[PDB]
């Protein structure tokens, strides 16, 4: 069992409100599996550019992907391109992560 981000890169608009992130499970599909994710600060900041999130992604037997939305924080203040990262971790017993196993998000400014 392998798990990774697909898409691994996300290009998002500051006005976009929310975007879906997607993690995929490959190999044996027949057993329950899970992986934890957590946003991580980059040149973009939790609290000011996006709202931080940590979670558990559960894959029941038979399901090979999980999606989750992340909220982008809009404002009226000019910036240039900025990144933050979502990272995977604590995969359940059978699981080994593959690349990408950290997703990259660029917030394109609009102001
Ligand atoms: Ca910023
Ligand atoms: Ca911003
Ligand atoms: Ca804006
Ligand atoms: Ca802005």
UniProtKB/Swiss-Prot annotation:
Ubiquitously expressed with higher expression in head compared to body (at protein level). Enriched in photoreceptor cells of the eye (at protein level). In the adult head, expressed in retina, optic ganglia and all neuronal tissues. Ca(2+) 4 binds at residues 14, 75, 77, 79, 109, 111. It comes from the Eukaryota. Ca(2+) 3 binds at residues 14, 74-75, 110-111. Ca(2+) 2 binds at residues 14, 49, 79. Ca(2+) 1 binds at residues 14, 49, 79, 82. Na(+)/Ca(2+) antiporter that couples the energy of a Na(+) electrochemical gradient to the movement of Ca(2+) against an electrochemical gradient across a membrane, which contributes to the regulation of cytoplasmic Ca(2+) levels. Mediates Na(+)/Ca(2+) exchange in photoreceptor cells and involved in controlling Ca(2+) levels during phototransduction, affecting magnitude of the photoresponse, activation kinetics, signal amplification, response termination, and light adaptation. Belongs to the Ca(2+):cation antiporter (CaCA) (TC 2.A.19) family. SLC8 subfamily. Contains 2 Calx-beta domains. Calx-beta domain 1 binds two pairs of Ca(2+) ions. Binding of Ca(2+) induces a conformational shift that inhibits the Na(+)/Ca(2+) antiporter activity. Calx-beta domain 2 does not bind Ca(2+). Calx-beta domain 2 contributes to the cooperative binding of Ca(2+) to Calx-beta domain 1. This is Sodium/calcium exchanger Calx. The lineage of its organism: Eukaryota, Metazoa, Ecdysozoa, Arthropoda, Hexapoda.
């Amino acid at each position: 069992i392998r798990m990774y981000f697909e898409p691994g890169h996300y290009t998002v608009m500051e006005n976009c409100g929310e975007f879906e992130v997607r993690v995929v499970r490959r190999g044996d599909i027949s057993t329950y599996a899970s992986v934890e994710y957590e946003t991580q600060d980059g040149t973009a900041s939790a609290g000011t550019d996006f709202v931080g999130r940590k979670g558990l992604l559960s894959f029941p037997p038979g399901v090979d992907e999980q999606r989750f939305r992340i909220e982008v924080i809009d404002d009226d203040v000019f910036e240039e391109d900025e990144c933050f990262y979502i990272r995977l971790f604590n995969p359940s017993e059978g699981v080994k992560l593959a690349v990408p196993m950290i997703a990259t998000v660029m917030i394109l400014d609009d102001d």
